Design a protein. Structure first.
Length: 420
């Protein structure tokens, strides 16, 4: 389909509110909240039973998988999950399962049956490359490769899941992933997502994400570096990748600290506005819609405070996601970045489609600054009357020299308008 229509929620099911054994039941009820917030895709962290020998914390990391064919019953049964994605589909939503196939848990059921499928040490036992709940797969193995594609197929054919986020790090070859697509595309056209900045991966994946942008972004907040490192990087990113590529934007995920730790409420909103209006595909990581600065505990017993009071961060999230969900500007238009007077303070970019425009002007520093923007390739002389999507204000911008002087502060400008 048009994968630019996806707005994604990363959900940690085991950590959801509710009782043990009943976590899918809970997430099923939560779909209506997610749907009404503008989510169309929920991305499940691994839901498999966890390694026992080697286990960090009382429960173990979800990324240390003891059985690729089973679900952690401290989350739910297969019935619970199968009910959960049927609900999702009824609600016109998509479900993605996390596929960590580059390493298994030390006591994963495969380490017994097939030691040969793993990288082995000098004396023939399965091992890892990096110095420990986890052991690395040997993907020179033709039988391993067929096992994995069939396990991905089962989950598809049995629970009708919609896509996969794959861990691609380490010794997994691009040909393996292409092999998966050759066998699984005819089964169902799935949403294929990975974490990578390797341009070749788009041969196998539709959407990727990486931390290139993210740390340039982190550095600007933490005062460590310039906004321009962040923006000029995004500005040139089209040139790092083939034509139809999609990048997934995010302010945090499971692997990163809570974004609300680093910004004020008012600054964060500028970055929320950015999240939902910038080219790409937005990620809401469970809890960020409540501006949670509580870290995900990922190995021990943990429940995230989901609901969650409906604060100004929650309302904005819903407002922007629902807006994107209902317009076709971001799914079909073109975004271009706009050079401005104050590149150390402000972000600015324009969408066109082709009468509909959205000029976004962001000011995460919040301080009142007048910024001028360059509209050379278009336009030189007009007065624009727009509605600022962010707060339903009215904003007029006059361009009278191919340029336009704008006052900003505290509130992001998401200036939606139409010429003709």
């Amino acid at each position: 389909m048009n994968l630019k229509n996806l707005i994604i929620y990363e959900a940690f099911a085991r950590a959801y509110p509710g009782e043990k054994g009943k976590k899918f039941l809970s997430l099923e009820k939560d779909l209506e909240r997610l749907k009404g917030m503008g989510i169309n895709t929920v991305w499940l962290m691994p839901i498999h039973p966890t390694g026992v020998e080697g286990r960090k914390g009382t429960l173990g990391s979800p990324y240390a998988i003891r059985d690729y064919y089973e679900i952690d019953l401290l989350i739910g049964t297969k019935g619970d999950f199968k009910k959960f994605v049927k609900r999702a589909h009824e609600l016109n939503m998509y479900v993605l399962m996390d596929m960590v196939l580059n390493h298994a848990a030390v006591d994963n059921v495969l380490v017994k049956k097939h030691p040969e499928w793993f990288l082995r040490d000098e004396n023939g036992n399965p091992t890892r490359k990096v110095p420990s709940d986890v052991v690395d797969f040997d993907y020179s193995n033709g039988e391993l490769r067929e096992y994995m594609i069939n396990m991905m197929r089962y989950w598809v054919e049995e629970f009708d899941v919609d896509g996969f986020r794959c861990d691609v790090a380490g010794l997994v070859p691009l040909d393996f992933w292409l092999q998966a697509r050759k066998n699984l595309d005819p089964v169902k056209r799935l949403i294929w997502i990975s974490e990578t900045h390797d341009p070749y991966m788009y041969q196998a994946f539709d959407i990727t994400y990486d931390y290139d942008g993210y740390y340039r972004f982190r550095d600007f907040i933490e005062g460590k570096n310039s906004l321009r490192e962040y923006i000029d990087f995004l500005r040139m990113q089209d040139h790092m990748y083939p034509r139809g590529y999609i990048k997934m934007r995010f302010l945090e995920n499971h692997d990163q600290p809570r974004v609300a730790k680093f910004l004020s409420r008012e600054s964060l909103m500028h970055w929320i506005a950015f999240l939902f209006t910038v080219k790409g595909v937005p990620l809401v990581h469970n809890g960020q819609e409540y501006a949670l600065k509580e870290d995900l505990d990922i190995f021990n017993e943990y429940t995230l405070p989901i609901p969650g009071e409906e604060n100004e961060i929650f309302s904005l999230h819903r407002k922007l996601a629902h807006y994107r969900y209902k317009t076709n500007v971001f799914s079909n238009g073109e975004m271009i970045f706009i050079r401005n007077d104050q590149p150390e303070r402000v972000i600015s970019y324009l969408w066109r489609h082709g009468n509909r425009f959205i000029l976004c002007v962001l000011n995460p520093l919040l301080e009142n600054t007048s910024v001028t923007l360059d509209f050379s390739g278009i336009w030189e002389n007009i007065c624009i009357h727009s509605k600022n999507v962010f707060n339903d204000d009215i904003v007029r911008v006059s361009v009278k020299n191919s340029r336009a002087k704008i006052k900003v502060g505290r509130e992001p400008l998401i200036l939606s308008f139409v010429l003709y």
